[PDB]
Design a protein around this ligand. Structure first.
Ligand code: NA
Ligand code: NA
Ligand code: NA
Ligand code: NA
Ligand code: NA
Ligand code: NA
Ligand code: NA
Ligand code: NA
Lengths: 294, 294
C-alpha cells in the first residue's frame, strides 16, 4: 500500500505472528487505541486524531490484511483477526487502554475488553456492533439485499468483492453523506488494488451477525453485550442521524442498557461518520476524557 | 398575563424594587437559573425543565416588563434590566448557581457572573451573546434589513414593535424550524397584547451590540467575554444548525477560546432552539451537570 500524502502521522510497525501490522502513533501517556472496520484502515481516523493530540498516546492500527498492514497467506476468519489484534496489543504492551472503535473494530475492541477487563480505562464507540442484528427484515434496507446476495454463495461474495470491488467503490461512498474527494477514495482503494487480495474483503460481510448467523459471532457478541451491561467502565456513544448500525431509537436503548454511558450527537451521518463529522467526533472524545476538569 | 395551559410549573413572584417579577420553580438543591431574552419569557424553557427535575432547584424568571412580570413605568434601558435581575437574584438569595441562558438572558447572566463570580457554579448557554456582533454584514439580508430599519429611528422602532409587533409575530416564528401550535404562539403574544406596553420591545434591538454600537453594551460585553476566557467555571455551549447568533464556525472558536467548555450539538435550529430541540437541550444540560459533579 502506498501511504497517502494526506495522512500526517508517522508509520510504525509491530511484529505479530510472523507478520507486520501497521499503526500510526502520536504522543505519550496512556494509550488511546483506535480500531477501524470494513473496508477501511487507520486513515479513517486522520481528521479525528488532531482533536486528541496531547490527550494520551494515540495508536491507530490497521487490522491484519488491511491498510498498510501485511497480508499474510491466511483465511482472515474472525478468529484470525482476534489473534492478530491480541498479538498487536501484546506486542506494544498496552495497558490502561481507552479504545475508540467503529464497525468491526468495535466487535474486536469489545471482545478484547471482555477478555481483558483489567487492561481497559474506557470505551468510546460509534456505529458499533452492540445488540446483534435480529434478522434481515430488521436490518437497514441500504445494505440488506447486498448482504443477502453476498452471503448466498462464495461465488457471489467473490464476484462482488474481487471483480466488482463493491464495498470500496459503492458501499463506502454511499454511507458517507458528503462527497469524498478523489484522493480520499484513492486512500481507501490503495490497500485493495490487487484482485486476488480482495478475497479478504469477503470475510467481514460473510460474518456480520444477522439472525444469529454466523453462530460463533452471535455467541461472542451476545457474550460481550451481556458483559458490557454489567461493566462500570466509562462509555461514550457517539451517534449520527440517521446512522446505520445505530439508528436514533437504539441510542436511547443503550443509555438505559449500559452503565455509565454518555452520548454525543454529531449530526448528519450514515456509517463512516468520521468522514462527515471528524472534528465533532474528536472533540466529543476529548471532552469526555477531560471529565469537566475533574 | 394569563398562565398558558402547557406551562406546568407553579407561578411565584418576587418583590424587586417595588414590582413583582414572575418566576416558576421546581425542586431543591443548588439552583438552575434560566434566563430568557427577546421577546420571550420563562415559558420558553417549559419543555427543557422536565429533563432537569431532580438536578437542582429550577428557577425560570421573567425579565422586568416581560412574561408575567409587572410592567412598571420605567425606561427599560439595559441598566434597568441589570438592576432588576440583580434584585431578583438577591431577593431569592441564589448561590452556587448554574445559569442556563439565551440571547439577552445570556448578556445579563454573563454580566452578573462576571461581577459576582463567587456565586456561580456553572454556565450553560445557547444562541448567546459572546463576542460582540462585528457588523451588520454578519446577518443575512432579511435580518440585516430588520435591524437596520428598526435602529434607524425611534419612529421606525415604534412602528415595528408597537404597531406591527414584528418581534413576536415574525422574528419569533421565523427563527424556529417547526411550526408553533396556536396556543404556543398565543403564549408569546399574551404579554404584549397592549400597544403602549410594546414600547418596551424596542430597547433590546436598539441596544444589541453591532459594530461596537452602542458603546455601553460593547464595553460590558467585551469585559465579560474577557472574563469568560479566563475562568475555569464549567461551561456548556449548546448549538444548532445553522443557528443564528452562534453559527457553526463560531462554535469551534469558542471550543478553544473558553476554558472548560463542553459542546452539545442538538441538530436543526435557528435562534429559539428551545422550541425545536427541548428534550435534547435538557438532556445535554443534565449529562454535563453529572459530568461536572453539579
Ligand atoms: Na503471520
Ligand atoms: Na439503520
Ligand atoms: Na460533542
Ligand atoms: Na418597580
Ligand atoms: Na448579588
Ligand atoms: Na437570519
Ligand atoms: Na471544547
Ligand atoms: Na475549552
Amino acid at each position: 500500500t502506498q501511504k497517502p500524502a494526506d495522512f500526517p502521522y508517522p508509520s510504525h510497525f509491530a511484529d505479530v505472528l510472523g507478520s507486520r501490522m501497521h499503526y500510526v502513533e502520536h504522543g505519550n501517556g496512556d494509550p488511546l487505541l483506535f480500531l477501524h472496520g470494513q473496508p477501511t484502515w487507520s486513515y479513517l481516523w486522520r481528521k479525528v486524531l488532531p482533536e486528541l493530540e496531547g490527550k494520551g498516546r494515540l495508536i491507530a492500527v490497521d487490522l491484519i490484511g488491511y491498510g498498510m498492514s501485511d497480508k499474510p497467506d491466511i483465511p482472515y476468519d474472525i478468529d484470525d483477526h482476534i489473534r492478530y489484534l491480541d498479538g498487536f496489543i501484546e506486542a506494544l504492551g498496552l495497558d490502561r487502554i481507552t479504545i475508540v472503535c467503529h464497525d468491526w473494530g468495535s466487535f474486536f475492541g469489545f471482545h478484547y475488553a471482555h477478555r481483558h477487563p483489567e487492561r481497559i480505562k474506557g470505551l468510546a464507540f460509534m456505529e458499533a456492533m452492540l445488540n446483534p442484528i435480529p434478522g434481515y427484515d430488521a436490518f437497514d434496507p441500504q445494505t440488506r439485499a447486498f448482504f443477502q446476495t453476498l452471503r448466498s454463495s462464495q461465488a457471489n461474495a467473490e464476484r462482488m468483492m474481487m471483480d466488482e470491488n463493491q464495498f470500496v467503490e459503492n458501499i463506502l461512498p454511499a454511507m458517507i453523506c458528503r462527497p469524498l474527494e478523489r484522493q480520499e477514495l484513492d486512500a481507501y482503494r490503495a490497500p485493495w488494488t490487487d484482485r486476488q487480495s480482495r478475497r479478504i474483503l469477503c470475510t467481514f460481510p460473510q460474518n456480520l451477525c444477522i439472525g444469529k448467523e454466523p453462530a460463533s459471532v452471535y455467541r461472542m457478541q451476545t457474550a460481550y453485550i451481556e458483559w458490557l451491561g454489567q461493566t462500570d467502565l466509562p462509555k461514550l456513544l457517539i451517534h449520527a442521524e440517521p446512522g446505520f448500525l445505530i439508528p436514533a431509537p437504539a441510542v436511547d436503548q443503550y443509555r438505559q442498557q449500559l452503565p455509565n454511558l454518555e452520548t454525543a450527537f454529531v449530526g448528519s451521518g450514515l456509517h463512516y461518520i468520521q468522514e462527515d463529522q471528524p472534528q465533532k467526533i474528536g472533540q466529543a472524545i476529548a471532552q469526555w476524557m477531560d471529565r469537566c476538569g475533574l
